[PDB]
């Protein structure tokens, strides 16, 4: 197995040679065994995502967060078909979880077992699923500034602009943090991105529980299944991937977003066209409901050079406002 076939990895980066970053291999993380939580003390209910190799399972777990209580928990772990680096990988996985911390905008580490059997990773559960699942089911429901209630079906679940624009904060605030500790992620798009209570979004990564196969939005491209349409050239072209790939991501993601789950780049098969009108500047225009002031987030973000595109603390501040200016 070349493991970028079946995920595309996320990166711990550290200072090398003079200004230059290189990766960390994630084996080499430490696992805090703080962690680790009773295998006997989960009670599996449905599969939430599988992939040729792994799957990710919705589970009730005993005494978790209170010692007198259960609660819902997503689980990630390995088919027995699985070889050695898929078990590695998900060690490494579990490793850089360890390694990140907390936050509100990421799926975050409860617990692992790793002893006996099988490596689970304990996650928090996400009520509503996948984010671009869920704008494409709520699509004909987005409701306009000053329109009537009773205009809609369901009113008190539909979708507006004001949703828009948290989503696309909560995204930005998450990645600042995996920024803010060396991380890049690699595969940011709306399918890594979960909802909860609260319409709070979480970013993660369902990985080797993805059929990544059969998802068109991964091309093979050289010994890799790559999600092109939201890669930065840098990376496509030249395998370099920084903060400012991540970014690119983010402005893909923001297109998808305010399309309300369209496909990005419609139209363009992946192919040498495609890159060639990358390479050119072609870049995709305004979707209908992005405010002026995000798309303008989105071009930024898809500037050929690197160095001009935002940072995620600059988005951030900048969506920040847009939010209070309403
Ligand atoms: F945001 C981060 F921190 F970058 C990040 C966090 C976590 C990961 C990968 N780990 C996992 C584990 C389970 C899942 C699927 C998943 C977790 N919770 C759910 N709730 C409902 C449906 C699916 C799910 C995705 N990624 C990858 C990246």
Redesign the pocket.
């Given at each position: 197995h070349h493991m970028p076939m079946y995920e595309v990895q996320?990166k711990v980066v550290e200072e090398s040679n003079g200004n230059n970053y290189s990766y960390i291999d994630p084996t080499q993380l430490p696992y805090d065994h703080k962690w680790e939580f009773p295998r006997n003390r989960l009670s599996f209910g449905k599969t939430?995502?599988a992939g040729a190799f792994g799957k990710?399972v919705?589970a009730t777990a005993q005494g978790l967060i209170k010692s007198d209580a259960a609660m819902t928990v997503?689980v990630?772990m390995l088919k027995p078909s699985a070889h050695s680096t898929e078990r590695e990988a998900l060690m490494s996985?579990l490793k850089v979880?360890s390694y990140?911390g907390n936050?509100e905008?990421?799926?975050?580490?409860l617990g692992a077992c790793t002893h006996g059997g099988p490596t689970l990773?304990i996650?928090?559960?996400?009520?509503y699923?996948?984010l671009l699942n869920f704008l494409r089911r709520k699509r004909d429901s987005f409701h306009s500034s000053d329109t009537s209630p009773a205009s809609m079906e369901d009113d008190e679940n539909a979708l507006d602009l004001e949703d828009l624009l948290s989503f696309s904060y909560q995204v930005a605030k998450?990645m600042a943090f995996?920024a803010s500790k060396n991380?890049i992620?690699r595969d940011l798009a709306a399918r890594?991105i979960?909802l909860?209570h609260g319409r709070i979004t979480?970013?993660?990564?369902?990985?080797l529980?993805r059929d990544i196969k059969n998802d068109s939005n991964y091309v093979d491209k050289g010994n890799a299944r790559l999600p092109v349409k939201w890669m930065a050239p840098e990376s496509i072209f030249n395998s370099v991937y920084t903060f400012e790939s991540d970014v690119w991501s983010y402005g893909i993601f923001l297109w998808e977003l305010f399309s309300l789950g369209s496909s990005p780049y419609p139209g363009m098969p992946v192919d040498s066209k495609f890159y060639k009108m990358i390479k050119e500047g072609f870049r995709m225009s305004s979707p209908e409901h992005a405010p002026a002031e995000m798309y303008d987030i989105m071009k930024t973000c898809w500037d050929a050079d690197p160095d001009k595109r935002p940072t995620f603390k600059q988005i951030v501040q900048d969506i920040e406002k847009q939010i209070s200016e309403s």
């Open positions: 996320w939430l995502g990710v919705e997503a990630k996985e979880l990140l936050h905008n990421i799926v975050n580490l990773v996650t928090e559960y996400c009520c699923g996948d998450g995996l991380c992620h890594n979960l909860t979480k970013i993660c990564d369902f990985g529980a």
